[PDB]
Every structure is written in C-alpha cells, then in structure tokens.
Amino acid sequence: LKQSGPGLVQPSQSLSITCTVSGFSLTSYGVHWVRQSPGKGLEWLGVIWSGGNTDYDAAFISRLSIRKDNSKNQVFFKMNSLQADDTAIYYCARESQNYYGNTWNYFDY
C-alpha cells in the first residue's frame, strides 16, 4: 500500500488524500479509513467496498465526499471546510468481503 497527501493546511478549506494499492485487486475488497488523534483512540468506519458506493459515519454526513476508481486503484477522498480542531493522523486499511466460516481476511494496513 501507498500513502501521499498534503499536510499542514490553513483552516476552512478542502483537504484531499489519495491512495493506491499494489497488492490485491480493488474490485473484490474494500477500503477503510480511520482517524487517530491524541484526544480519542481512533474513530469511524464509514467506508466503501465492492465498487458499490456506500455509507458514511452518522455524525459526519455534512462533509466527506468519497470516490472509487478502477483506472489504477485510486481511492482518493476529500473534505470540505476543514475545521481547525480536526487535528489527527489519517489511516487507510483493506478489508475482505469474503466470510468463510471464521477464517476470514482482515485489516492489513
């Protein structure tokens, strides 16, 4: 996996992060996103998978646009009107839509 995005932005603007993937094929898996602050432990899994664009976290519907691609594996997302006290580090993850008994692939960051 890879990770690249601009940091230290002045407040009240948009803010976007891209990510690729060089492991699995993005069609039959899912991408997950969490934040991690010094304030709380870590937070939501309002995420997307399978190509079907799906749900968000319940508190943050008013922001968090999301897109999924297949050109080469771009899962880049964005944020509108970045409030200044949203100081954290953002983490991406993979997920398998493939429950099989209980041995089931999960969370290789």
Binding site: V21, S22, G23, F24, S25, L26, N70, K72, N73
Partner: peptide
C-alpha cells in the same frame, strides 16, 4: 483495461 490481476500484484491488462 483491468488493473492488477493474476495471483498477486503487478499485472495490468
């Protein structure tokens, strides 16, 4: 064009 399929990783089509 399909991206990154076949047993692992880096094979586009």
């Amino acid at each position: 064009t399909l991206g990154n399929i076949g047993k692992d990783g880096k094979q586009t089509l």
